[PDB]
Amino acid sequence: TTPDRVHEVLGRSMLVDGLDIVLDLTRSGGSYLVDAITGRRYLDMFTFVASSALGMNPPALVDDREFHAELMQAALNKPSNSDVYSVAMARFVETFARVLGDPALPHLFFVEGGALAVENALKAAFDWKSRHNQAHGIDPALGTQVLHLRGAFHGRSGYTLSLTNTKPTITARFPKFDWPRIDAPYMRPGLDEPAMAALEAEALRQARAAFETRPHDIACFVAEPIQGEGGDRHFRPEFFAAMRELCDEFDALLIFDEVQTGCGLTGTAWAYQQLDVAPDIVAFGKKTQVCGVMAGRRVDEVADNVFAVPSRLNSTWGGNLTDMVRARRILEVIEAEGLFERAVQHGKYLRARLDELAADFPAVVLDPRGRGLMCAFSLPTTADRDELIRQLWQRAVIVLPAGADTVRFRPPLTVSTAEIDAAIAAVRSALPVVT
Amino acid sequence: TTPDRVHEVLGRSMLVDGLDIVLDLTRSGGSYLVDAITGRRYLDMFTFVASSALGMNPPALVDDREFHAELMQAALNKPSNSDVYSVAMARFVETFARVLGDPALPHLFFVEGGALAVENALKAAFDWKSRHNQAHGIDPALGTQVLHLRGAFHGRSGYTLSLTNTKPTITARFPKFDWPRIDAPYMRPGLDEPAMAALEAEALRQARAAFETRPHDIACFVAEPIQGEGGDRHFRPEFFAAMRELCDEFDALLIFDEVQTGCGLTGTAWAYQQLDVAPDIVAFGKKTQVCGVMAGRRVDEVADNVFAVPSRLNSTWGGNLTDMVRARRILEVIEAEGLFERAVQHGKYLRARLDELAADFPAVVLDPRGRGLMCAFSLPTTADRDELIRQLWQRAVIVLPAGADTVRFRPPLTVSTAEIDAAIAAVRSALPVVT
Ligand SMILES: *Cc1c(COP(=O)(O)O)cnc(C)c1O
Ligand SMILES: *Cc1c(COP(=O)(O)O)cnc(C)c1O
């Protein structure tokens, strides 16, 4: 079948609501997607929903003939890594630990899919709480609830549907656990230190109330360090530091969902490293290709936890071996080329341009914000936001919406300042048209 | 790192409870795994937990230089197939529909992981029931329960943990929905037609009672056509035909979990094709590499079902593109070489040898059984079963346990009769030692 027949062929079997283009797998590269139908190049600030660290066909991978052989060996088959170990697997695991590891979180577990990474973090917590309860004369049937935020997105699986609360479309008509949900005290424009502190105190009150009215039954608090799908909502470190203390007071684990923030986007391996809060468990995915959890801190206080006892966590494959081999090469590039530091510097650049945009269009470009390359701004109404996205598409720039009124930038870690300038130039061209 | 250091490297980060070997990715082939440490060849009746249709490094894939180029193009990157379409993707989808498709089940949806394939089938059903309820003046809050079997294994995710009930280790201390569970009327040795009919009638009574006491609230019945992890338990077609009628009487969907039975193992594309029962939805995975659902029949009666309305089902990647390209080549081999028919004929061979074994060891080899290459027998006690597996391992034959006392065979579709003879020869050698 031919590029111009792709949408037709797929439309016989599936709902085809994606992009108008057909991806050219060979000619795409770096910060550009190529439409196989026209040959038009599209500037990529979307990166497969932030799941591509280096963009398409990175030179370091494409030109590495030794790596080609290793990738081909992995790609021909699909072993169950749960049961059957390989050198390819071990090299990925040791490089993951070296580049992204945290000495407090030594337990690694891999799985296909970001929602399942979050679920395995939850399962670790439910088990830990029940066993901790038991060891202290509390009923082991207690420890089954998850404290979480309004505006959270943690995935579309059985447990994470009880947590995710962004668009009603995602969760409607699906059975859910009644788990406690608190307000998200995110930073907003024109709130001073004491105004922020008061917003945080209210969420903290709600959190405490949940712990006190469901005694011994809350296993964990889970959060995104920056809420992505909910609208690039950033939180002060003070808020998470307070939650860290409150979790310890009630013997509950703190879990960060770094599926979107992780692997260098904010300028450090993990966003939590910049907030100075130590989680007990971190769920990761997207840019890591293989998904999973890192666990430690208080997890180790329960000797028969899910990382110590066989068959408590599992899947058939234990992650995709091809993804492991690709991720390990990507991690080596990140380490070798200092890409976390590049994210810091280019992230400062992108943010400075967004501040400039806000200065030039004060009633239109609202709340420019970001940490590293994870940047966004908002529009007055959702109609303006939707129109801006259409205008950018017409100009061959791909960006994603978030929430009711946000436009988010998700460039690759390898983005150049000229590429950022081109994205900003397109936004400047489009804005007078939307107003 | 070196083959002899693999277990050491992994043991720093993970629980290492898998096989003693290190898989040689290059030298393994067909029905043999090669240990990279010793060079010892292992006869493979395990196939990555039945997830390998052709075994390792099939010649048709390894020798196909055009396919190498296509696989490499897919393997270098990992697009979000949910949003971004490719020729590689469309070719997989059209070949999937051609080789495994059912004209009554035209809606296809793909995802990474077998538990999530089952979950998306459940989500389709919950949505369908709620919308069907609504369209008939019933409260749309109703339609949230799943009728299922004792001994079922449907995965380890948030919804499937409420269904799976084999070993307590899998489900203990994890929150669950209270969903109705009925006895499984599987075939057992020394039960005649009327004895079987009476067992089935009792499960059918329990099913009816569930529908009557939870009115409008059961969205679906889900079953494995042959229960795998629970012990290779086979059901008469009569039982599923009765369940099909009862589902229609109470406006509930029938879903088969073919993750283990599917893609030719029983001798047809799907096990349900041999039971003459039409499901509304089928979940697939393992051998298909990419997982997902096929849906149709009554699903289409609700016009705004989950396959017709954007954003009701989703994941970031929409399945792994590398898996799609590999699966499409595997499907082409199956079709070209008549592998379903080969499974029928070699399955008859394997079963005949197991009958012979039962004749020679009547108090030890119990209940030889199978459909196609999906075959098993049981031992008197779990200690005998565990010992037989150890004895086979010592003889370089890999098989899997199931349930309390079952040994299961999961050979590749390409297994030869000489390879089956070698497996049977090892069982014959080991048996006197276990007795
Ligand atoms: C991407 C996303 C997930 C879900 O990951 P999938 O691979 O789509 O299931 C979970 N949490 C966050 C914060 C996400 O961005
Ligand atoms: C393999 C299995 C699953 C779970 O699939 P995973 O990929 O391990 O999540 C679901 N149902 C059945 C019948 C299975 O055999």
Side-chain angles (χ1 to χ4, degrees), chain B residues 149-161:
Chain B
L149 301 174
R150 299 206 143 78
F153 183 91
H154 296 298
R156 291 176 183 252
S157 74
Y159 288 149
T160 55
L161 261 353

Side-chain angles (χ1 to χ4, degrees), chain A residues 315-317, chain B residues 113-115 118 153-155 224 229 257 259-260 286 291:
Chain A
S315 69
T316 303
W317 287 301
Chain B
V118 176
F153 183 91
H154 296 298
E224 299 156 85
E229 307 302 309
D257 178 350
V259 170
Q260 199 170 146
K286 284 191 175 93
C291 305

Side-chain angles (χ1 to χ4, degrees), chain A residues 305-323:
Chain A
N305 69 68
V306 99
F307 306 101
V309 172
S311 221
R312 296 286 288 143
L313 312 178
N314 201 48
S315 69
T316 303
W317 287 301
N320 195 308
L321 185 66
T322 302
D323 287 344

